[PDB]
């Protein structure tokens, strides 16, 4: 029932209403998600990182979506089968170095097996608290905005 | 710069490995492109081993040190084309350099005898002071054909323009031969013939001005 | 859905100028890096140049055999890419394609290099740099007789004779009839002019009723001929 475009637009809406991306941002992300897939498989649980290369970006932010039912994403690397994604990290990077820092931080946090197990059961407030604590401890992540309304379940 | 083998042969159904050599490939992935005879290049492999839109899973890419290899497993007749590699050359030489290209030949495919259609000069072309015999050759494999023209029963070299054989849509090959002459020469002889030799076999079509 | 159409291929004297255009559709042209690639007759692919998007500075880069003579510009409002070519030489005679440029980068490797590639290519337009003069084609019918049919099928075509330079495209019935159509590669006659033929295989029981028309398009002379092939 939940498509890729629905996920992209739902994760982009709070960034648009808070003034950190332009309106067309989502419409471009979808486009890039067709040409540059962002599907990742980390110990069964799938992860997607939709983002742009700085276009339509006013400030840095993360938008987290927790899919209760997996949605198929084309893999970052080639495979005969796609990736059943349950966790989506919408990335709004203004410069290339910000995008690289956020990508490295996401790579570091998705390998956390217990944290990825907790992400699929905690509420929005607890996910916000955990991700805020993990962002404050990262010296490369600070400068990226993260609010309570940047986390949502899509069931 | 990037270096490729100019020509590479492979048996139908077997696995081929066309390689690209260059120092820059030590720190940059290579992109591979397929160009069928008269068409435009298409992307087949980018990055480590990624395929776009609807490219068959027979195409795979790999990198080992200073070399990059496009691997076609289970070769088919439609793979008989030119393949080009691309990567960032050294540093500030240019920015993107293409390899010299590798011409892939798929050997053992079904052979076919050529179909020969010979058109005499049209009425409109004869109302003008011209006359051209058109010999059209299609649906043959391999793409090797010898054309010989005959007036009545004697060979004719002057006025013959023959194209090199070219691959068509169904992987077959086609070629054409033209014989330009004056309408006074056309009405002079009793017949004209286009002989096509292919794998020792000869197919000859004949036209006559008395028609 | 992504379509790139080149235009501007014509005959140009050595030392002359020429502007090639490429219309883009199916994607946001404003955010796409664009490139020009060229291929000489019987040779390999040669990257001509590249232009970025306005978000990344809109800067332009060219290849060494082109620096100082070629320029690449873009109109994002019209979704159009332009390649201006001055001080042209015979070596510049080639087919020019407009490609879009995408980028790729690793995630797990720890290194984040950007690797650009050309994923969407246009069909290309042919620029011929010669001191000869353009000549339009003469189109004649290759009508099917009762003695040259293949049973239920019959081959009928059009001869496109004495034209220069290339290319010449042929369709049949304004692009509708496509089953069994083959356009042969041209031949360079001794007079420097070109000639080709285009055949279509049709039902033999459809020669007196159906009307067949070959559409010959020769852009270097702005010529279009619609020759109706009649049965005899």
Q: What is the CATH number of the domain that holds B70?
A: 2.60.40.10
CB-based contacts of B115: which residues, under 8 Å, 6+ apart? B137, B138, B139, B140, C150
- Rounded Cα distance between B134 and B113, Å, is 19
- Rounded Cα distance between C198 and C169, Å, is 9
Compare CB distances from C28 to A28, A36, A76 and report the shortest one's residue: A28
Task: Give yes or no: residues B125 and B197 share one domain.
Answer: yes
Residue in chain B lying closest to C64 (CA): B94
Residue in chain B lying closest to A77 (CA): B50
What residues of A are in contact with residue B50 (Cβ under 8 Å)?
A: 77-78
Burial call C103-112: b when 16+ CB within 10 Å, e when fewer: bbbbbeeeee
For chain A, the maximum distance between any two Cα atoms, rounded to a whole number of angstroms, is 39
Residue in chain B lying closest to C142 (CA): B119
Please report the domains of chain C, with CATH numbers, ordered by start residue. 3-129 (2.60.40.10), 138-229 (2.60.40.10)
The total of structural domains in chain B comes to: 2
Residue A49 contacts residue A84 (beta carbons within 8 Å)? no
- Residue A97's SS3 state is helix
Residue in chain C lying closest to A55 (CA): C55
- Rounded Cα distance between C190 and B179, Å, is 12
Rg (CA), chain B: 23
The owner of tokens 């404050």 is A136
Task: Give yes or no: residues B102 and B66 share one domain.
Answer: yes
What Å distances lie between residue A63 and A50, A143, B48, B155, CA to CA? 10, 15, 29, 80
Does C104 contact A54 at a Cβ distance shorter than 8 Å?
Answer: no
Burial call C171-188: b when 16+ CB within 10 Å, e when fewer: bbbeeebeeebbbbbbbe
Q: Chain A contact for C109, CB < 8 A? A: no
- Rounded Cα distance between A86 and A66, Å, is 6
Min distance A77 CA to chain B CA atoms (Å): 6
Task: Give yes or no: residues B43 and B127 share one domain.
Answer: no
Give the closest residue to B163 by CA, choosing from B183, B200, B136: B136
- Rounded Cα distance between C149 and B26, Å, is 60
Residue A53 contacts residue A96 (beta carbons within 8 Å)? yes
The total of structural domains in chain A comes to: 1
Contacts 24+ apart (CB under 8 A), B180-187: B180/B130, B180/B131, B180/B132, B180/B133, B180/C189, B181/B131, B181/B132, B181/B133, B182/B129, B182/B130, B182/B131, B183/B121, B183/B126, B183/B129, B183/B130, B183/B131, B185/B131, B186/B121, B186/B126, B186/B131
Contact partners for chain C, using 3 or more CB pairs closer than 8 A, are: A, B
**Helices and strands (H and E) in chain C: how many:** 0, 19
- Rounded Cα distance between A70 and C223, Å, is 57
Task: Give yes or no: residues B10 and B73 share one domain.
Answer: yes
Number of Cβ within a 10 Å radius of residue B126? 17
Min distance C186 CA to chain B CA atoms (Å): 7
Task: Give yes or no: residues B156 and B198 share one domain.
Answer: yes
Compare CB distances from C47 to B43, B94, B162 and report the shortest one's residue: B94
- Rounded to the nearest 5°, which phi and psi values hold at C177? -70, 110
What residues of A are in contact with residue C107 (Cβ under 8 Å)?
A: 40, 49, 76, 103, 107
Count how many residues are written for chain C.
232
**Helices and strands (H and E) in chain A: how many:** 5, 5
Which of C1, C25, C26, C31 to mutate to test binding with chain A, by most A CBs within 10 Å of its CB?
C31
Residue B9 contacts residue B57 (beta carbons within 8 Å)? no
- Six-digit token string for A117: 């197990």
- Rounded Cα distance between C175 and C178, Å, is 7
* C60 DSSP β-pair partners: C51
- Six-digit token string for C142: 């290759």
- Rounded Cα distance between C42 and C37, Å, is 15
Q: B97-98 and B42-45: which strand pairing? A: unpaired
Where among B63, B78, B106 does a domain terminate? B106
The owner of tokens 């080149």 is C6
Does B96 contact C155 at a Cβ distance shorter than 8 Å?
Answer: no
Give the closest residue to A155 by CA, choosing from A84, A86, A75, A62: A86
- Distance of alpha carbon B173 from the chain centroid: 7
Give the closest residue to A36 by CA, choosing from C126, C32, B206, B144: C32
Task: Give yes or no: residues B91 and B12 share one domain.
Answer: yes
- Six-digit token string for B195: 């002989």
What residues of A are in contact with residue C56 (Cβ under 8 Å)?
A: 54
Q: Which domain holds residue B161?
A: 115-207
Task: Give yes or no: residues B130 and B183 share one domain.
Answer: yes
**Helices and strands (H and E) in chain B: how many:** 2, 19
- Six-digit token string for C46: 């040669």
Residue B131 contacts residue B180 (beta carbons within 8 Å)? yes
- Rounded to the nearest 5°, which phi and psi values hold at C45? -80, 135
Min distance B49 CA to chain A CA atoms (Å): 7
Where among B76, B106, B136 does a domain terminate? B106
- Rounded Cα distance between C210 and C215, Å, is 16
Angle (CA) B29-B32-B35 rounded to 5° is 165
- Residue A136's SS3 state is helix
Residue in chain B lying closest to C167 (CA): B38
Q: Chain C contact for B99, CB < 8 A? A: yes
Chain A to chain C Cβ contacts (< 8 Å): 25
- Rounded Cα distance between C83 and C93, Å, is 14
Task: Give yes or no: residues B136 and B189 share one domain.
Answer: yes
DSSP H helices in chain A: 4-17, 25-35, 96-110, 113-119, 124-136
What residues of C are in contact with residue B204 (Cβ under 8 Å)?
A: none
Technique employed here was X-ray
Q: Which domain holds residue A19?
A: 4-153
Task: List, in sequence order, every beta strand (DSSP E) within chain B.
Answer: 3-4, 7-10, 16-21, 31-35, 42-45, 59-64, 67-72, 82-87, 97-98, 102-106, 115-119, 131-140, 146-151, 154-156, 160-162, 166-167, 173-181, 192-198, 201-207
- Rounded Cα distance between C194 and C220, Å, is 13
CA dihedral B63, B66, B68, B69 (to 10 degrees): -90
Where among B106, B138, B162 does a domain terminate? B106
Instruction: Determine whether B209 is exposed, middle or buried from the number of CB atoms within 10 Å of its CB (0-12, 13-18, 19+).
Output: middle
CA dihedral C119, C98, C124, C115 (to 10 degrees): -40
- Rounded Cα distance between C2 and C4, Å, is 7
- Residue B69's SS3 state is strand
Task: Give yes or no: residues B167 and B128 share one domain.
Answer: yes
Task: Give yes or no: residues B78 and B154 share one domain.
Answer: no
User: CATH number of the domain that A53 lies in?
Assistant: 3.40.930.10
What residues of C are in contact with residue B139 (Cβ under 8 Å)?
A: none
Task: Give yes or no: residues B28 and B92 share one domain.
Answer: yes
CA dihedral B121, B127, B128, B129 (to 10 degrees): 80
Residue B99 contacts residue C44 (beta carbons within 8 Å)? yes
Task: Give yes or no: residues B90 and B134 share one domain.
Answer: no
């Amino acid at each position: 029932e939940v498509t890729q475009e629905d996920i992209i637009r739902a994760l982009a809406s709070p960034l648009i209403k808070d003034g950190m991306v332009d309106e067309d941002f989502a419409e471009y992300v979808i486009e890039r998600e067709k040409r540059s897939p962002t599907g990742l498989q980390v110990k069964g649980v799938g992860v997607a990182i939709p983002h742009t290369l700085g276009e339509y970006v006013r400030d840095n932010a993360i938008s987290v979506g927790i899919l209760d039912k997996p949605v198929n994403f084309e893999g970052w690397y080639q495979s005969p089968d796609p990736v059943p994604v349950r966790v989506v990290f919408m990335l709004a990077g203004r410069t290339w170095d910000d995008i690289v820092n956020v990508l490295k931080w996401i790579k570091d946090v998705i390998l956390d097996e217990e944290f990825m197990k907790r992400l699929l059961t905690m509420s929005d407030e607890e996910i916000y608290r955990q991700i805020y604590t993990r962002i404050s401890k990262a010296p490369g992540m600070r400068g990226i905005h993260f609010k309570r309304e940047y986390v949502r379940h899509l069931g | 710069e990037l270096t490729q083998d100019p020509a590479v042969s492979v048996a139908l159904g077997q696995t081929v490995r066309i390689t690209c050599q260059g120092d820059s490939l030590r720190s940059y992935y290579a992109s591979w492109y397929q160009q069928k005879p008269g068409q435009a290049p298409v992307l087949v492999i980018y990055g480590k081993n990624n395929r776009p839109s609807g490219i068959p899973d027979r195409f795979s890419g790999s990198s080992s040190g200073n070399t990059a290899s496009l691997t076609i497993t289970g070769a088919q007749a439609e793979d008989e084309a030119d393949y080009y590699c691309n990567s960032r050359d050294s540093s500030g030489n240019h920015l993107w350099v293409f390899g010299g290209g590798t011409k892939l030949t798929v050997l053992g495919q079904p052979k076919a005898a050529p179909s020969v259609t010979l058109f005499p000069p049209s009425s409109e072309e004869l109302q003008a002071n011209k006359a051209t015999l058109v010999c059209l050759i299609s649906d043959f494999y391999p793409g090797a054909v010898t054309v010989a023209w005959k007036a009545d029963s004697s060979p004719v070299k002057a006025g013959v323009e023959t194209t090199t054989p070219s691959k068509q849509s169904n992987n077959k090959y086609a070629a054409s031969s033209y014989l330009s002459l004056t309408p006074e020469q056309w009405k002079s002889h009793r017949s004209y013939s286009c002989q096509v030799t292919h794998e020792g076999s000869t197919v000859e079509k004949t036209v006559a001005p008395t028609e | 859905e992504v379509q790139l159409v080149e235009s501007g291929g014509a005959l140009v004297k050595p030392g002359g100028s020429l502007r090639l255009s490429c219309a883009a559709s199916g994607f946001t042209f404003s955010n796409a890096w664009m490139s020009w690639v060229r291929q000489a007759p019987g040779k390999g692919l040669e990257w001509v140049g590249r232009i970025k998007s306005k978000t990344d500075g809109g800067t332009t880069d060219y290849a060494a055999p082109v620096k100082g003579r070629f320029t690449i510009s873009r109109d994002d409002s019209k979704n159009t890419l332009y390649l201006q070519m001055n001080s042209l030489k015979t070596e510049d005679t080639a087919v020019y394609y407009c490609t879009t440029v995408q980028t790729y980068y690793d995630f797990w490797s720890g290194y984040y290099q950007q690797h650009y590639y050309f994923d969407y290519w246009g069909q290309g337009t042919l620029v011929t740099v010669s001191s000869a003069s353009t000549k339009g084609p003469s189109v004649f019918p290759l009508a099917p007789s009762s003695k040259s049919t293949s049973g239920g099928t019959a081959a009928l075509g059009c001869l496109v004779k004495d034209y220069f330079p290339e290319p010449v495209t042929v369709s049949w019935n304004s692009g509708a009839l496509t089953s069994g159509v083959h356009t042969f590669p041209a031949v360079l006659q001794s007079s420097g002019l070109y000639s080709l033929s285009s055949v279509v295989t049709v039902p033999s029981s459809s020669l007196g009723t159906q009307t067949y028309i070959c559409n010959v398009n020769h852009k270097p002379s702005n010529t279009k001929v619609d020759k109706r092939v009649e049965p005899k």
